[model samples]
Target: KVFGRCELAAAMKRHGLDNYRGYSLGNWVCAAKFESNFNTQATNRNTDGSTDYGILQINSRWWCNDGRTPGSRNLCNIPCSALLSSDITASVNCAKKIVSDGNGMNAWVAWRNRCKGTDVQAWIRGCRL
Candidate 1:
């Protein structure tokens, strides 16, 4: 819980995440809110037996190697725990890789379900860039 919306925006800017690697800060903020409520250590088990990790809730089936899960392509080549950190660099990098791999923000179920066409101005509201 290193962030609320304002702190999250500042951190993202400091890390160069605002518009970094070709995506909007609002895209990241809105998706993270729905996925994990900005909780870095968040994890959720899916009905399909896979899991989602970190603030972005990145799926284990594609991005991270959870060790116990055994079959992940680990496309981001990062340990799952790395995504579960307040620093969020690993999670951000993996997200960029996912988008570059052609998923875009569509990689996040939350993004598709909640943020795709919704008003996301609040995600960046009152933030100083």
Candidate 2:
């Protein structure tokens, strides 16, 4: 798990995600907090039986395959395990893809419901970025 918000911000900046894409760093940080509470190893089974993987909680039904699943699009083309790593580069890249797929951060329900149009500056409040 992330020790604090600053560390998470640093990682995001290292990936040039500090406002590199259309979304802000706060949006990403806030989404992570709500989605998985910064736990890289987090997983949740959806009502439909598909699983969400990693900090961003990407879905097996669309983003990555959990293996043994018959029809995962695996659109990110990376294994679900990869997204669960402490290193968030792959996950961030895949998230970018998901955003570009036209849903933007709407691809993440957490973002739409919690972070969207919300004042999320606290997510990066103490970060040096």
Candidate 3:
């Protein structure tokens, strides 16, 4: 499902994304805006032949099992397709795993380019956190 900007922030906050791994809700919102535009089904194929899946664009190379993606680490032990679901439970949990494994939010290049070190509060300005 495509989510509204603030709507995405609200949903993410409920999942406890705010202040997760030293990143605020706005930082997560900023990453989502650029990564998937708040669309749960968004996907991108990387130059390395792996695909990035779902809202945070979790990559298949290390996180999920996309059958076509050879050498998948599948650290999340989840099918890549599950990340595309609107429910976002699998996606969110996998994202938390990413941070937990020490990759930090920098694991998302979109966040590195557009979100890191920026003033992110505007990303969730109108949303009640």
Candidate 4:
């Protein structure tokens, strides 16, 4: 299936970013959908003036890499234009790295289920094309 390839690509991108050890796209997409319904252009602001931006709705302020420190906080700051640009892989890879370490994908899973508030598959289903 095409989604599998996309998931693998995103997974590899994530693995490479975390030095071959971290969350996979399988877990990432789960979180994305959980956080923002898999909508790459999602955005919202709380009454506390905090903001959630883009598909993954990353918090702009805490966005950064403690390891390679590659790229910019903008990776999580904006709408993740890369998702819609000519280089989505970059965004995927970057996200993997950003969320790597510690509980990793499990954290993503928790975030997703918390937002989704339900049990669900890690990967989307019923893509027949």
- Name the candidate that leads on lDDT: 3
- Compare candidates 2 and 4 on lDDT and give the better one: 2
> Candidate 2 on 1-129: residue-level lDDT in tens?
553678887788788776655777988899998898888888999877789998899999888988845568999999999999989988998888888887678888888898999987779987887
Taking every candidate in turn, the Cα RMSD to the unseen true structure, in Å, is 1.7, 1.3, 1.0, 7.4
lDDT for every model? 0.82, 0.85, 0.91, 0.45
Q: Write the per-residue lDDT of candidate 1 for residues 85-124, one digit (tens) a residue.
A: 8898998888878877766778788889988877776788
Compute each candidate's TM-score over C-alphas.
0.89, 0.92, 0.95, 0.49
The regions of model 2 sitting more than 4 angstroms off are: none
Better of 1 and 3 by lDDT: 3
> In candidate 4, what residue range of length 10 has the lowest lDDT sum?
64-73
Which run of 10 residues does model 2 get worst, by summed lDDT?
15-24
Q: Name the top TM-score candidate.
A: 3
lDDT of 4 by residue, 1-129 (tens): 113434533543444532335343345555665566655555565454445544555544345222222333553443434443333454455566555645444434446456343433335344221
In candidate 3, where is summed lDDT lowest over 10 consecutive residues? 120-129
lDDT of 2 at 26: 88
Which residue pairs show backbone clashes in model 4?
none
Ranked candidates, highest lDDT first: 3, 2, 1, 4
Can you write out model 3's per-residue Cα lDDT over 1-129, one digit (the tens) per residue?
A: 998998888999989899998888999999999999999999999888999999999999889999888788999999999999989789889999997886799888999999999999889997766
TM match of model 3 to true structure = 0.95
lDDT of 3: 0.91
